[PDB]
Amino acid sequence: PQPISRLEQCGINANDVKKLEEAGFHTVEAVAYAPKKELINIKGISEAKADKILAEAAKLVPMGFTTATEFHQRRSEIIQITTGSKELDKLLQGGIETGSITEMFGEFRTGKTQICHTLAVTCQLPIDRGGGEGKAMYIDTEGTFRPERLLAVAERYGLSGSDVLDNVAYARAFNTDHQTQLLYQASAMMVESRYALLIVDSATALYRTDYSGRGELSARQMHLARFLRMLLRLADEFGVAVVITNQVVAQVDGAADPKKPIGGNIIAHASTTRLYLRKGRGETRICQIYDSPCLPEAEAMFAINADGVGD
Amino acid sequence: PQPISRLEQCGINANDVKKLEEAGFHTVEAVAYAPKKELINIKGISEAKADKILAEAAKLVPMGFTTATEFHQRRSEIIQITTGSKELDKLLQGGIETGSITEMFGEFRTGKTQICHTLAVTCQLPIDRGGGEGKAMYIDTEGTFRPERLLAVAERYGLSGSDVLDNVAYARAFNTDHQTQLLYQASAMMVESRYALLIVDSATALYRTDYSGRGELSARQMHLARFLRMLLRLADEFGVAVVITNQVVAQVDGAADPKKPIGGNIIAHASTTRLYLRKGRGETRICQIYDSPCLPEAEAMFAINADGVGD
Amino acid sequence: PQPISRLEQCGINANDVKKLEEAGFHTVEAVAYAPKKELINIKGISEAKADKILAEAAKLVPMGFTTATEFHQRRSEIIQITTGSKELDKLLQGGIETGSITEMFGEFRTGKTQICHTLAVTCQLPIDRGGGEGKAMYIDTEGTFRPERLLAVAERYGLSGSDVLDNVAYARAFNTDHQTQLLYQASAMMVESRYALLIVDSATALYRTDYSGRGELSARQMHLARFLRMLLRLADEFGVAVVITNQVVAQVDGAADPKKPIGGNIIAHASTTRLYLRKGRGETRICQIYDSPCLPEAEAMFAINADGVGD
DNA sequence: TTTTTTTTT
DNA sequence: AAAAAAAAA
Ligand SMILES: Nc1ncnc2c1ncn2[C@@H]1O[C@H](COP(=O)(O)OP(=O)(O)NP(=O)(O)O)[C@@H](O)[C@H]1O
Ligand SMILES: Nc1ncnc2c1ncn2[C@@H]1O[C@H](COP(=O)(O)OP(=O)(O)NP(=O)(O)O)[C@@H](O)[C@H]1O
Ligand SMILES: Nc1ncnc2c1ncn2[C@@H]1O[C@H](COP(=O)(O)OP(=O)(O)NP(=O)(O)O)[C@@H](O)[C@H]1O
């Protein structure tokens, strides 16, 4: 939450600063987490300038060794937002954390985008209810976003729907490259008001249709790695929350399970957490954890009512 | 364990010594293992000064031929720390050695960072239990570090959790270049109190996202070689232990196994040891050795309980 | 095997001789193979003195034309040491020769250092078994040397392990320049007792991490050429044997094989022989010749048992 | 002369 | 069962 204007200090030119602004950098911490080469490659910058700049990023953000205790005390206050249902709150142990990346595993009709809606509204609850009190931006990439459902959840939690829709900064990606511009604009929007959550329904879906590899493929992974790193660039700074929804890739000639998310290893190593969603009978659905260091594997039911997620 | 102040002797200027301090050198042995050119390139140093300096490094640290017997007698006392479970102690033949580099091979959900936690606590056990009695520094590079698990292992071994967390010098890298500064600061911290273990979850992960080669690539390997050499600079001096966790790179158009760690040859040649981790059913996991001169290939189960590694 | 004291003759001053001793020269033949300029450049020497000196080197060592027959008769007695397994003895046609330089081509886990161990012990066998009866010096440069394995081979050949370890003059290089001092000390040790074999695991490995060229590079090759020439200076005098282990450099944008040893041409032209080692299934490994004038290309299996090299 | 990266259905 | 393609120091 530290604007570059604070770096408009110690002899840096304000127009040099406004050169820096155009990189999509807008906070001192973003400069602190910027690799030297990215900062060099942009034109009109001698490396010594970067010595000054990075010296200032160190000047504001400490980057040394830290006690495990202090880290624990800073871990004490992560919000971990409620999902809007109890059993998920038990699975996730209080729900999805801020400052992290999450994952929807499903085949279809698993209510993953549904959960994205309910989270999108429930971030706006007062913190006592677990909401981050943070405006929510929703990067849809299939156009499947439904305001009507947001009004339904608005009925569900008693807040006026108009207030809910006043936030929820919907955006509609098409090109794989477009998502990048949407990220830089996101970072541009982060400066003004503490947002709660980024959601992405199908970060991966564009990558199937565009990169018919291999390939390709080696380019596809090449792009995803940067995308996910940028998501870390946001999440490591402004908490809020990162949600990723993945289409599924069914194996052939496997054993006994015919699933696994597309995107290969690079997605898998990146996410702090992972989830998997099998349909039950009727509305009922089954969550099941993968790859969360915080938690033992667990599984649970939830119905998708008119209010969606519940019991 | 020999501070440069001992080299504040034989006519070397104390301010020349304090020029040397800034190189990240802080021990006489580090000077002894310093190549001539690195010592020259830093400003304010005539080569004759380096003749004096190196003459003193020889003056304190012997560097001649040695009997195999003597080397055996010095090999007799390496701690090789317990992993916190018996079957791993059998695989590794008493567990991970001090003075060496180690490797986690996994795809995801293989509990490699898990093992990093349990080691991070178990270094603090009394030596009879195999702990090096050495403070542990943990260079995380995905932010996935969990103090809570350290408290769990603290329950597991009966030591108070607060004492465990009093050490564990967590540090949070972002830039690829940042890891270097964290290394020099590490070497700076080595002087004060004998540490047990360096851990790095993902030394390699930054290198994917930053160097989208080739490339690049030729620069990426160029950087990794120095990084690993520095890890040798630490490990060859202060024992403790070096742990490396590697994301995986799945082959395409191979035969029959679709794995191999990224980083290419340069990582592979460097490590004294190597490990590989396939998930079993349930919590159970399978370790399997690569590239350990000390040991025949072997493999074994272990569950990841609430206490993590065990049976 | 001719000490400089024999040159303490024909009017040369004994203190001039003891000036010469400091050059790392310790044998008359070394003086005979010394280029005029190296001998001049060292201080306190007029060129006429070098006329005397070289005249004496000619006075003891003949350096004229020789019949091919005589050379054959002197080729008749080269030991070519057994490798400790039969099929390698067939490939190498009786095993590695004395008076020569050899090469390990591998990617990792190819058992090259393993073979270095078994050779290191098997030089000590009586000559009927092919051992040179020569003490062995082992210049490790990754610290990976394991006395335990030497004890294992000692079990393998029935000689007491303590006697084996009584030799095996282990030495631990770090700097690229350090290897040079280790060479001059080696030559200093050659005078006292006929050694069998020099081994070097990774002559090349330091050169990657230190010279991140190009460069550099032009300096790197500049150093390697001298290093290899010195290895010839030893090998051309005292037989014994020279073994070189090379890390691998995988090509990009090649055809169909993604290998070749680092060090470029200068290593390649130097070695009398060359070997290449592909892993087989299980312990089994595959040797394959390069660049041996003596031999047609061939290839063969060998297992790496608890006793290492065998069948 | 140096330097491997990538899964889909 | 069966599927390529990718530089720059
Ligand atoms: N009006 C409704 N009444 C009851 N249940 C509903 C209603 N609308 C949606 N649902 C539930 O929500 C699900 C919607 O599928 P969902 O999995 O949320 O979309 P998705 O996972 O994104 N699949 P995709 O089309 O690829 O985006 C339906 O299968 C129902 O279970
Ligand atoms: N609360 C818990 N209860 C039981 N098992 C757990 C719990 N938390 C973590 N685990 C186990 O630990 C694993 C964590 O994955 P792990 O492989 O340790 O992370 P990772 O290898 O670093 N993958 P990455 O996300 O790329 O860092 C889970 O898959 C579970 O097997
Ligand atoms: N105890 C053991 N039992 C069986 N086989 C073993 C044992 N110890 C070592 N080996 C074998 O020896 C190999 C050691 O690798 P090796 O190629 O000899 O080291 P290296 O080639 O020098 N690689 P590097 O680490 O870069 O030095 C293992 O891969 C095994 O095949």
Side-chain angles (χ1 to χ4, degrees), chain A residues 220-221 262-264:
Chain A
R220 181 173 67 87
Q221 300 298 319
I262 65 104

Side-chain angles (χ1 to χ4, degrees), chain A residues 286-308:
Chain A
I286 295 174
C287 181
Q288 173 196 157
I289 298 169
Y290 292 103
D291 192 5
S292 66
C294 297
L295 301 176
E297 180 178 1
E299 62 186 345
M301 305 300 291
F302 62 89
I304 299 172
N305 292 338
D307 293 347

Side-chain angles (χ1 to χ4, degrees), chain A residues 124-157:
Chain A
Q124 293 180 338
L125 290 178
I127 298 169
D128 297 347
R129 294 185 176 179
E133 282 195 346
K135 297 180 178 176
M137 333 142 189
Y138 179 87
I139 299 171
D140 187 355
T141 57
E142 290 182 349
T144 59
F145 171 79
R146 302 299 178 188
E148 299 175 351
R149 188 53 58 94
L150 300 182
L151 292 175
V153 178
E155 295 178 353
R156 201 260 189 70
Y157 291 128

Side-chain angles (χ1 to χ4, degrees), chain C:
Chain C
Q2 295 182 336
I4 301 175
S5 65
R6 294 186 183 178
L7 295 176
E8 294 173 349
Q9 182 65 262
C10 189
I12 299 170
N13 288 335
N15 287 341
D16 291 346
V17 170
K18 292 177 178 177
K19 291 177 180 178
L20 297 175
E21 295 172 350
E22 300 173 352
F25 299 164
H26 299 293
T27 58
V28 176
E29 295 179 352
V31 176
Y33 306 143
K36 171 65 169 171
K37 63 188 182 72
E38 180 178 1
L39 196 149
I40 294 171
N41 292 337
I42 293 170
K43 294 176 179 177
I45 295 172
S46 66
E47 294 177 351
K49 291 176 178 177
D51 286 343
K52 295 177 179 177
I53 296 167
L54 296 176
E56 295 305 319
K59 181 65 173 173
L60 293 178
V61 178
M63 296 302 294
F65 292 158
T66 55
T67 60
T69 56
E70 181 180 3
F71 179 83
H72 188 279
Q73 295 175 336
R74 290 185 182 175
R75 181 59 61 183
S76 62
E77 296 303 321
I78 282 94
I79 300 97
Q80 58 183 18
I81 299 169
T82 62
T83 62
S85 64
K86 290 180 177 178
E87 298 180 355
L88 292 175
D89 289 342
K90 292 179 178 179
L91 294 174
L92 299 176
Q93 190 65 256
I96 293 171
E97 291 185 353
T98 59
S100 39
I101 298 190
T102 62
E103 219 122 11
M104 300 339 210
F105 267 37
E107 194 195 56
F108 79 132
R109 58 148 117 169
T110 60
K112 53 188 183 295
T113 59
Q114 187 70 254
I115 292 172
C116 294
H117 292 292
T118 59
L119 293 174
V121 173
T122 54
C123 290
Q124 293 180 338
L125 290 178
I127 298 169
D128 297 346
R129 294 185 176 179
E133 282 195 347
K135 297 180 178 176
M137 333 142 189
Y138 179 87
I139 299 171
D140 187 355
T141 57
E142 289 182 349
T144 59
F145 171 79
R146 302 300 178 188
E148 299 175 351
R149 188 53 58 94
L150 301 182
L151 292 175
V153 178
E155 295 178 353
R156 201 260 189 70
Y157 291 128
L159 295 175
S160 63
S162 63
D163 290 344
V164 177
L165 299 179
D166 285 344
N167 293 337
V168 182
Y170 171 82
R172 171 57 177 159
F174 297 99
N175 294 337
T176 55
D177 291 343
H178 184 199
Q179 292 176 335
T180 61
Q181 293 178 335
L182 295 178
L183 292 180
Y184 290 95
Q185 293 183 338
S187 63
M189 289 300 296
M190 299 305 297
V191 178
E192 298 178 354
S193 87
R194 289 213 133 113
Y195 259 128
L197 174 63
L198 279 171
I199 300 173
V200 183
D201 185 310
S202 64
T204 60
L206 301 177
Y207 292 89
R208 286 190 179 178
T209 58
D210 290 347
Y211 296 131
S212 64
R214 32 156 232 53
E216 292 88 0
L217 195 148
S218 65
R220 181 173 67 87
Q221 300 298 319
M222 174 177 171
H223 193 279
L224 287 174
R226 292 184 180 175
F227 179 79
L228 300 176
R229 182 180 178 85
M230 293 303 297
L231 295 177
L232 288 176
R233 178 182 293 179
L234 300 176
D236 292 346
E237 295 173 353
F238 301 148
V240 176
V242 204
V243 195
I244 327 196
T245 338
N246 323 16
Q247 247 77 226
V248 192
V249 175
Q251 291 86 359
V252 178
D253 289 345
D257 292 344
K259 299 292 184 290
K260 179 183 289 181
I262 65 104
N265 305 126
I266 295 176
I267 291 175
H269 303 294
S271 64
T272 60
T273 64
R274 185 67 60 84
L275 293 176
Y276 177 70
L277 299 174
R278 294 173 298 179
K279 185 186 78 178
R281 295 182 183 175
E283 294 183 350
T284 60
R285 309 297 171 83
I286 295 174
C287 181
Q288 173 196 157
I289 298 169
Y290 292 103
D291 192 5
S292 66
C294 297
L295 301 176
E297 180 178 1
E299 62 186 345
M301 305 300 291
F302 62 89
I304 299 171
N305 292 338
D307 293 347
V309 178
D311 285 345

Side-chain angles (χ1 to χ4, degrees), chain B residues 63-118:
Chain B
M63 296 302 294
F65 292 158
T66 55
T67 60
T69 56
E70 181 180 3
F71 179 83
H72 188 279
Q73 295 175 336
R74 290 185 182 175
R75 181 60 61 183
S76 62
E77 296 303 321
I78 282 94
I79 300 97
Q80 58 183 18
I81 299 169
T82 62
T83 62
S85 64
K86 290 180 177 178
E87 298 180 355
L88 292 175
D89 289 342
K90 292 179 178 179
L91 294 174
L92 299 176
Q93 190 65 256
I96 293 171
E97 291 185 353
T98 59
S100 39
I101 298 190
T102 62
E103 219 122 11
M104 300 339 210
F105 267 37
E107 194 195 56
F108 79 132
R109 58 148 117 169
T110 60
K112 53 188 182 295
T113 59
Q114 187 70 254
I115 292 172
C116 294
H117 292 292
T118 59

